[PDB]
Symmetry: D2
Subunit: 497 residues, 4 copies
Amino acid sequence: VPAYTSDADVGHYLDGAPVAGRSGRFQDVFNPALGRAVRRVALAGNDEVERAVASARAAFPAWADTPPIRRARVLHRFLQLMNEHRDTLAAIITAEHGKVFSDAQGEVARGIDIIEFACGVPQLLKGDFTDQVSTGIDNWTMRQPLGVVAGITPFNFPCMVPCWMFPVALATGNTFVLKPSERDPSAALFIADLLTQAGLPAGVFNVVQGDKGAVDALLDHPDVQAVSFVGSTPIAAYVQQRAVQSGKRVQALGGAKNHLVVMPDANIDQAVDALIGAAYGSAGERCMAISIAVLVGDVADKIVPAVAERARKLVIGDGMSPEVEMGPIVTGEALKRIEGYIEQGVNEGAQLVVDGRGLRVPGREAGFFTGGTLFDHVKPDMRIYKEEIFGPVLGCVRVKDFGEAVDLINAHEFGNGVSCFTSDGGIAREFARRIQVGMVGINVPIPVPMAWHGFGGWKKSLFGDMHAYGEEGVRFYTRQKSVMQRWSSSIGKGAEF
Amino acid sequence: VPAYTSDADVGHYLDGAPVAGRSGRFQDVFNPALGRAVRRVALAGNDEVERAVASARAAFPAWADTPPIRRARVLHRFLQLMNEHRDTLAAIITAEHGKVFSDAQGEVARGIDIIEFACGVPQLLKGDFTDQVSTGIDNWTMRQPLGVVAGITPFNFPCMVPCWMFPVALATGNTFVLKPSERDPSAALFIADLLTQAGLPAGVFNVVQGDKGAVDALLDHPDVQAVSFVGSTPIAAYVQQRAVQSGKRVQALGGAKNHLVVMPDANIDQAVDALIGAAYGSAGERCMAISIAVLVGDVADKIVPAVAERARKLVIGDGMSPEVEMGPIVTGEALKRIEGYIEQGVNEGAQLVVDGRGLRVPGREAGFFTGGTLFDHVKPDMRIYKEEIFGPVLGCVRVKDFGEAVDLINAHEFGNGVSCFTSDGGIAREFARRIQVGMVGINVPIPVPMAWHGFGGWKKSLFGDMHAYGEEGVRFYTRQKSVMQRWSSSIGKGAEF
Amino acid sequence: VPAYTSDADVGHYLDGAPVAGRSGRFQDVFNPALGRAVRRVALAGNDEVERAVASARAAFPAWADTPPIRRARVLHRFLQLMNEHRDTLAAIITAEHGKVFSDAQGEVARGIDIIEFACGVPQLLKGDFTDQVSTGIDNWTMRQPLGVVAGITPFNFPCMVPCWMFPVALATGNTFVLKPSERDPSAALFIADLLTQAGLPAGVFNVVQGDKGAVDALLDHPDVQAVSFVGSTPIAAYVQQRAVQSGKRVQALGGAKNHLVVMPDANIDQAVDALIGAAYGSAGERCMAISIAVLVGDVADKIVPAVAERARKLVIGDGMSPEVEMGPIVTGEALKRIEGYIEQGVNEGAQLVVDGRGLRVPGREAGFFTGGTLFDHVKPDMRIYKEEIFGPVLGCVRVKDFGEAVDLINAHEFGNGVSCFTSDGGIAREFARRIQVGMVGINVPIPVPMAWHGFGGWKKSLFGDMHAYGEEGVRFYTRQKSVMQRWSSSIGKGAEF
Amino acid sequence: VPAYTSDADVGHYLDGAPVAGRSGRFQDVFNPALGRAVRRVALAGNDEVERAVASARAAFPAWADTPPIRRARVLHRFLQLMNEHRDTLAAIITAEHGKVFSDAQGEVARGIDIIEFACGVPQLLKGDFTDQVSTGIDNWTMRQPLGVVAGITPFNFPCMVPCWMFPVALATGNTFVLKPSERDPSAALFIADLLTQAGLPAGVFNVVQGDKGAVDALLDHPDVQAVSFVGSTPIAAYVQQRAVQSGKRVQALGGAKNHLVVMPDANIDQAVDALIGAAYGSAGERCMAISIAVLVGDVADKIVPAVAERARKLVIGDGMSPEVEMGPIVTGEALKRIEGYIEQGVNEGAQLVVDGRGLRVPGREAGFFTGGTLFDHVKPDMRIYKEEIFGPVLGCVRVKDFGEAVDLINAHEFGNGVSCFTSDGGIAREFARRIQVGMVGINVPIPVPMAWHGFGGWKKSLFGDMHAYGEEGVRFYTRQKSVMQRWSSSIGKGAEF
Ligand SMILES: NC(=O)c1ccc[n+]([C@@H]2O[C@H](COP(=O)([O-])OP(=O)(O)OC[C@H]3O[C@@H](n4cnc5c(N)ncnc54)[C@H](O)[C@@H]3O)[C@@H](O)[C@H]2O)c1
């Protein structure tokens, strides 16, 4: 599969067709491996957002009246098409985001998993029927679609996060307007085209490109019923407040600071492999990336020297090269912020075991590249421990026993993911049932739940009370109706009745 | 059972014991049938709210560690005690609220139904277990309690609405702080005493009396996790906004304007009986009360003359008299507001078929009594159609056919309850699946769902995305955790392993 | 699509490849439209059955260890292949069975529906997890595959009935041996080939052709765990007895005698259309075919004259002709038995309104053709009312009111399907909740439940206690295991633990 | 609580009242601690069985028409009564069965748990409702009662096993006829009296005493729909065959041979305590009793010497003495058979570490008493390993590693219960998912599942395909009905419609 190249402007999607921007405002889109802009993306105004919402509202009733099995068959055709063109989408993601090609393939596969789950929506839409609640009265419940829903997605997963939202929403009978991240929008348009090739009626799925202005226009529109958001914690709080102020259902996912605990009885080699992978995959630009390593007892001297040796030997380069393990950062501002965090960590007393600054890649000297960074003797009061770096920086914190590690983890402001490596059943049971984290792994560095369970963190990692996809996602996109029924005597109509 | 009389001050409940107020501010509590104050209720300050929250937080961990079956057994003993003392509670409710004694007995029975449902919580807390999601990895989910939750309840159901909230919350493993309506608080204290007699540990259930100040103190406290509110629409919106601003889970129920549709093929006598009962039970002080009668075709001339004849013959008096069908209004200000609504309805062109103003009850001349009021030829642009009166006022709106009635109902701002009387299966099916209302009745004037389904309206009748009690109530009070587990080889420990 | 022609012998399927018979015994296979044999089918001995069972048992462990999502993906590829080659399978079914081409297409579509449901097996295999049943003890359940299962299918649905069984059994992790009807076996082999093209491992699905001897060999084999059977009532009882005697799980479906009730307030034209279709589709060779019309009140004179007029105008001929509505009978012996039933009905006093005997089709004079037959004034004591004819014969029974019809239906020995045509809600509710029939239709002549509900009749129509496909089908193919877990203190291993 | 004494004849229960026997045949009932008969029990003939079945069939329709919530309230009152009189029932059980008083109290508590689960039947009877399966068609399922069901129970649990059956059957809407064990029938009558005091209508619950003749009369009766049986394997197979031959739903539970595995990393003291308790509680007369101890590696020398030391120090005497840990055997024939098994074990080469024969209890010299017996070096080919002794006999089998123990357990003919003691997570996971046993314990000697999961073994331990109580028990007592509904246009009735 050849590398993705294109210079045309990136527009919006409306009525089952691409449309060029009309506001006159554009933003450059960079190739991170080259360090220069390659195309532009239009920034939609209020009128284009209103046009997309009107199209979705016009399309909603007929799509809602469609039986769920036919909607599932449309999603089945879309799944076939997605399996057909996975390499092209992965190449687009590598070109714009900058991750490794195999990582993009894995992201596409993870989105296809959610689509596979959504294909079975007739089973998921079962209501409850109760007969003879009193003498001659029956009572049953069902769930019905809301209307027009909106989704706002980040840059690090331009394909998987939209697949967390739109398949289930379309399966339950809603219409969707998507606002992708402006740093890598092309994938969204690609997906929309595939949705049109699968037989989806026009207006059911629309795309608008833009920034904070388009988000505010979406949040203020009275014809929008629900909002799903994925991003950082402050923006999630702002989105939740503004959407609740206008009377909408909101779910918003925030940031993370994920810990991995190594017990004295853990497998050392597997723990080192897990730490390396989960800390330096995709250059640490994942919500489930491990950023703090908690070392218990005397295993620290068996972990830090090994991990450092693996950190210096990472292969860094262009994402389309097969042997490359880590790609560049998305933008230069993010790279500068990561370097500032490293400088702050050095200034506040943490030991800099491995320094990744000042990296030059041959043939990619202008790319936004950096090396892996490893700290030691990190303290809870340091800024590199409390704040989210979102880069290839790993810190090590040493504790005396299991209870100290549990208390340290429970005191953090984030509750997204946690992992523990051990061979003892009782320790695993107590850690699983005592930790204040939404997603827990036992010898699993990145515990992303399956498509039929749902994704969601605790504390400041989630604003709302429902999770993404799964049965939680099904319930978020529908509203419950109850019906109580009885009849009187029919002898009036005739003796036969 | 004798009438309830008492002159002691009404205080708060803390640590399994009543406590007198310490702020120094009190509010009078009236007997509506007599028209004069009979006791006082203390208004808690910020310090007393903080004390209650601290007690609940101290009690939370041990109660959460208790197995669900033992919590269910505590609730079972509480159910036995509630069945033992139902008449005393009903007499208290009649004395303070002013409803008929049989109506109070029905309210207590409806609360006991929710307690009966909550007794079966071990079945409801089943998680999902999946084996071999990949080779050697298992994945399971569970739901865990939130912590300290708060409930805010209105005056019209001083017993049933608190039973919508605290039984399920206690069954799932939370601690509860209740803020009852200050117009009739005594019942809450009674319930708390019963909860202590059933073996509930101290601090798990606390009561604070007060007003907007106590509500703000509860909404601002950082140790409170969830808020449940029942009341009018503006206060519900205010509560939701203020609680979301501090990062809490919120559910808030608002007002209503319930319609009943009479089709040309309906049973006339049963329709008249249903209209009379559902419009003039409890003096129209119910969220599920019918306030608009929609008459289709030529049945209007068969409905209005009959209903009016029943409206003039209502027996009105003190709630403890067995023959009385309707009691007084809760306060004199509410009576004045209802009379103002009647005057407005006369001024705007509606025909006043039956006028209930200027009623004097022999022996209860100082009571807040009023008669039944019936309007005719009500239009959608009138204020008596758009706004909630919350009194014994019924208006009649005439339409030409089924579609006009459906369009009229779907254009209202409220979506709480709706009813339709017919003998045709297709009309019932289309009405049930097309109406934009949360709770639907077919020949059922007041379609309150069963304890295992849940209570909730649509549009401006509910702020949030979860319903009260049932599985929705169970999910509102818990948070989901996912666990993924795997193990490595054990050959290192020995050849036997 | 051309008509299907082939003269090769029909063999068995083993280890992912066709195999020729080795017993030396064959049976002729007829083309019903031509009236002559066109090919042969081998009849397997005991050794070939044992070979198939051994292959399935050898393949079972690896297939059971496969994660459910990969099995679902194999079924997804099989679904794609089935959608690709539906017309060829329909042509084969028309050539051997003799039904109309559109009817065969509908049968293939109905099987594809069950495959679509089975593709979502990871959701269906969720167990129950409960935490802290007592202090420190957890309890969870799961369902695991049985092993080798066997299926026995009739002639009238050579594709749909096997799809009732093998997709769910393969999804839950079992291996399958199929014994198709010897009258039309080719479709089974076709399906097996498709299953091999989708990536199914060898030995997971095997086919053996034969007769009572092969069935007895399957029922006596100690390595077979479960048996599913579809056929007539006496054979179902025999199969259940013989399989239970050897300690196996059994489900067996029997015969039917389906009634349709016409109320005085029903739509006459729609009732006539439903009666014609459900009585003369596929020449009455369906378990859900309507064979008795129950007429209530004075509607009989509006039903019998119309239906008869439609019965004389049926177009009968070769199944590949587009304008043909009814095809021939499967064999000449069945045609002779149907004619004997008609003669018996004439002899016992029923009025022969329309006689279908003595039919000659131009160009198909040797085919097993017969016309539609209509009786009137049928009594419960007649043999044409009590016994199943399984042909294009419809009888009419007149009753006075609703209760008489209900009592008549509840006294029959069969309980498979029932239908009622009315416009009254109360009558529909009472009929649905009072009738002693497994499958009920309100204005639906053939109420076959959806893929996510399950298929099953009552009384003599089913031997066992579980239904086919759906959650019932999932539970039939799995066994439940419970696990209770606890751990002791880990302080012995170290102070850190 | 005083010891239970009574000399009146034990009769049957009919129409909510005790009735004396009329056949003229009686059987003596022994006090095992005294060794002499104390009363008689009548053995019902065919006519009395027919009378009980007729009474149940007469009572069935009204009980089935009762709403489930009222049936649940009847069960709630019964639960209150059972909690009130638990000590009297325990004393009766101790007097007739001969177990320790605390053991009888535990049995009563375990039955009360099942009653508590059954009190929540309205939630469990939820059907599935699906809207718009096609355009204008809805489909929903429900479950309805079967009719008259019969239960047959053993001697070792005269209270708990009947509570496995009749509460769920009554909750789902059936009528029950009970055939208790003739060795200790009084408890059944006691329970029936309590059921009458709770408001149960007459004829819903009937009791018949007897033996094989009464069982055959029950199995042959055409008005009985379902049979539940608990007992030994040969009788279970006979009952299943005879009940299937007459077309009934059957579930039958058989015998057991439960193994406990001790790993080298297990806690030695806790393992010894578990072995002693689970092997010598209730004199080994439990289906979940541990009869084989599997010792892996070098732990055998740390287990056998300790266990033997505990086996010689057991306190044996009358069950009403507080300090007694083990009571006598139920009959003298059972004691003789146990002694014969011990003699056979000595003859076939097993080492008799501890011999319990020749025991004399001071003051109870005529009682059917025996001591604890411990064998060592037991082989799979011995009769004491393959056959069920059902007494206080424990054998020890030594294996080399984990795989040998798993292979040994999987080769047995019984699959009821299994336990494994270890501190390693991976070993526990592999043992739980690989063992061919229905009920599994990790560090739990007796893994009886909770009331909301269900009880059932595998292989020769269960005949049928459904388990006892839980959702399996709910599904066994009900049959599923499907309803598909649609309506035509209503414009014919009028323009308004
Ligand atoms: N949707 C439902 O299920 C439901 C049920 C019952 C009643 N209601 C509604 O309740 C209303 C009648 O009850 P009410 O008159 O007691 O309602 P309300 O709005 O006064 O709510 C009562 C509660 O809110 C508190 N409250 C009142 N004003 C407040 C303020 N400004 N700030 C903060 N807290 C404040 C009170 O102290 C009390 O605890 C009607 O509108 C009726 O429709 C709704």
